[PDB]
C-alpha cells in the first residue's frame, strides 16, 4: 500500500518525517498506513517493534528516547521493556 490520496510525506526543519493531509488541511507524525500495519498494543508486538503511535527518536545529549503520540509525551524508559517487566510480574 502507498499513501492514501491527499496525503503527502514531508520533512521537518531537522529532517524529521511527518505527513500532510491536504484533504483535511492537517499534519501528523503518524503514517496513516500505520493504522493498518502497526500492532495495536505492546502485547501485539514481537521483537523490537513499537505499537501504534509510538516512535523511537535520538537526542545527542540523552541518546535514544521514546515518543508516545497517543498522549503527546516523551520518556527515556523503554516501554517495550516496561511492558516485559510488568507481565513477568
Amino acid at each position: 500500500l502507498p499513501l492514501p490520496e491527499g496525503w503527502e510525506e514531508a520533512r521537518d526543519f531537522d529532517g524529521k518525517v511527518y505527513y500532510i493531509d491536504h484533504r483535511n488541511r492537517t499534519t501528523s507524525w503518524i503514517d496513516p498506513r500505520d493504522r493498518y500495519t502497526k500492532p495495536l498494543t505492546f502485547a501485539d508486538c514481537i521483537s523490537d517493534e513499537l505499537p501504534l503511535g509510538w516512535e523511537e527518536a535520538y537526542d545527542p545529549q540523552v541518546g535514544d528516547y521514546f515518543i508516545d503520540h497517543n498522549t503527546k509525551t516523551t520518556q527515556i524508559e523503554d516501554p517495550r521493556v516496561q511492558w516485559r517487566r510488568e507481565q513477568e510480574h
Partner: peptide
C-alpha cells in the same frame, strides 16, 4: 540533561505558506 519535550507537528497553513 533530561529527555526532549514533545514536538508538535508543523502547522498546515504555515507549511503551505513557507513553500513561498
Amino acid at each position: 540533561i533530561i529527555v526532549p519535550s514533545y514536538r508538535p507537528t508543523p502547522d498546515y497553513e504555515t507549511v503551505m505558506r513557507q513553500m513561498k
